[PDB]
């Protein structure tokens, strides 16, 4: 049988040979930048669920050089507090991540400190509440923005000094998450709000089910479970779970691979690439905090197949070796954004996405 722990370390070292930058302490600068925080994610994530440490240098490097303030958003005064209120989430929940991972209080001031900033773009005079994702412009309030904020407010609920405080945010962000039609009637995340020209009221703009907005919410949900021990947030992670899980939605096929919306057409961009791992990993907390909320012991079963079942068939299909040589000893994995489709050609937001669903194996 497969070894997750191993594949994973073989993903990451094909990220570091093709694509991460030592003078930069970055993978990809030709990539977005959110996207190293996704990767840096990953990287602490199979430290946390393998114990190993041997990347931990790296992560204190890109954190020490990525949280100055960013070239393009000087205003944000570094701490990861950038342009856009999700690219700041992305690095706020690594960094809750590292918090887990070596208890250093450094992390979780810095995922303080983001959480501050983008409480700055939340307003309760559109929509009802919620924050806008573009801070130039402030005009999409989108399901990614929110569920980043939500599963952040809600991680340091649990994490935090003045956590009740977070407590109350997370449980008001969830209250307005739901009651603002973006989970439509298969219970599935679309991209976003649409707001109305006459009246101003807000209703879900019917843009494409992303996999990342089925994950993120995940994560959110567990995490309020675990500041409450109410089941009832688990039964909604559940029940958007289902959904993802059901081939008649269109996300899962029916060979039983989770599929992007954009794969079909080969039209996945940079940033959808990376979409799948994080739901991949979302639902691993999910199972895991399903599992553990019950005596019975087929409970999260089903997402834990699930993982299993794309881990063979990415493995077995989507993946590829680095050419090892006289002088470059170095080995690892490639991977396509097809889980089951045949791999092209790897990039790095493609490569994070697979370290997900292997790291959300182990
Ligand atoms: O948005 C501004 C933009 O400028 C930088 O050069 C890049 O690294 C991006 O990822 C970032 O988002
Ligand atoms: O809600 C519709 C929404 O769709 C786009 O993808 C966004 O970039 C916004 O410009 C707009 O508000
Ligand atoms: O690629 C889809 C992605 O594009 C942009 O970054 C935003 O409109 C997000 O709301 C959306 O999920």
């Not at 930058?21 to 990287?43: C, Q």
């Not at 956590?163 to 989970?183: K, P």
């Amino acid at each position: 049988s497969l070894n997750s722990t191993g594949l994973a370390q073989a993903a990451i070292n094909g990220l570091n040979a093709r694509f991460y930058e030592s003078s930069n302490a970055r993978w990809s600068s030709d990539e977005p930048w959110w996207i190293s925080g996704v990767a840096l994610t990953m990287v602490i994530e199979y430290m946390r669920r393998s114990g190993s440490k041997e990347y931990l240098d790296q992560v204190e490097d890109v954190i020490e050089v990525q949280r100055q303030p960013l070239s393009w958003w000087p205003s944000g005064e570094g701490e990861f507090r950038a342009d856009a209120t999700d690219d700041t989430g992305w690095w706020a929940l690594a960094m809750v991540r590292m918090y887990d991972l070596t208890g250093n209080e450094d992390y979780l001031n810095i995922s303080i400190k983001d959480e501050a900033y983008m409480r700055q773009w939340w307003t309760d005079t559109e929509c009802g509440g919620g924050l806008y994702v573009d801070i130039q412009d402030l005009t999409y309030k989108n399901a990614i923005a929110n569920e980043l904020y939500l599963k952040l407010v809600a991680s340091l609920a649990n994490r935090a000094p003045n956590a009740t405080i977070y407590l109350d945010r997370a449980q008001q962000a969830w209250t307005w998450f739901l009651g603002s039609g973006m989970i439509n009637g298969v219970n599935l995340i679309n991209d976003g709000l649409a707001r109305d020209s006459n009246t101003g009221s807000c209703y879900n703009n019917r843009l494409p089910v992303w996999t990342y907005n089925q994950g993120v919410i995940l994560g959110a949900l567990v995490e309020l479970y675990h500041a409450t021990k109410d089941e009832s947030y688990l039964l909604s992670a559940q029940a958007i779970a289902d959904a993802v899980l059901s081939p008649s939605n269109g996300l899962t096929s029916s060979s039983g691979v989770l599929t992007e919306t954009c794969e079909g057409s080969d039209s996945c961009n940079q940033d959808q690439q990376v979409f799948k791992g994080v739901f991949a990993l979302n639902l691993a907390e999910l199972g895991d905090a399903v599992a553990g909320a019950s005596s019975d012991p087929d409970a999260g079963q089903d997402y834990r197949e699930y993982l299993d079942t794309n881990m063979q068939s990415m493995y077995a299909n989507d993946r590829s070796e680095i050419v090892p040589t006289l002088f470059d000893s170095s080995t690892g994995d490639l991977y396509d954004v097809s889980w089951s489709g045949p791999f092209r050609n790897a990039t790095m937001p493609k490569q994070a996405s697979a370290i997900g669903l292997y790291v959300a194996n182990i």
